[PDB]
Design a protein around this ligand. Sequence first.
Ligand code: QJO
Length: 167
Amino acid sequence: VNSFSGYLKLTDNVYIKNADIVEEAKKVKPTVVVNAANVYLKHGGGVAGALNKATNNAMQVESDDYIATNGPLKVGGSCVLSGHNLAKHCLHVVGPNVNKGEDIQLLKSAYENFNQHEVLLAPLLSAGIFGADPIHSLRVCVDTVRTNVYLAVFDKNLYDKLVSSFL
Ligand SMILES: Nc1ncc(S(=O)(=O)N2CC(F)(F)C[C@H]2C(=O)O)cn1
């Protein structure tokens, strides 16, 4: 038993809710919140900008030190950093950005990072400003992640579509 509420169960291990991941994070304090990161951990907009703002820019300060030490992430890769006031940990995951021409097949590699964590609160990778089809992203999530994932979908219209079209 865990503290997530109002989720619709999609599969054995995937759940989904129309929610603002920032607000869901501040209420659940999950062990892991997933960020929709870029390779530079520049949290300017989308999910990342919103999560960083909720940390009063502490996420960005920590991220800049991470990059200065380690260099950029790979597309499809991830790193674990602090969750600040939102979660114990933040898993920063880089899905391919269609608006940068990156290969969509890397979306499966991105979701594989979730399997290193038993339970996660996460957005749909490569959705939103990353330019992928969220229905495709949901399909890859369901077919790749084996751990328990609680997906927060900000847009109510999209949430309903995702539900109504789910196979
Ligand atoms: N607060 C906040 N801001 C942005 C995002 S998103 O852009 O990553 N995301 C992914 C999506 F589902 F495909 C569309 C969008 C959403 O959930 O409506 C998430 N949460």
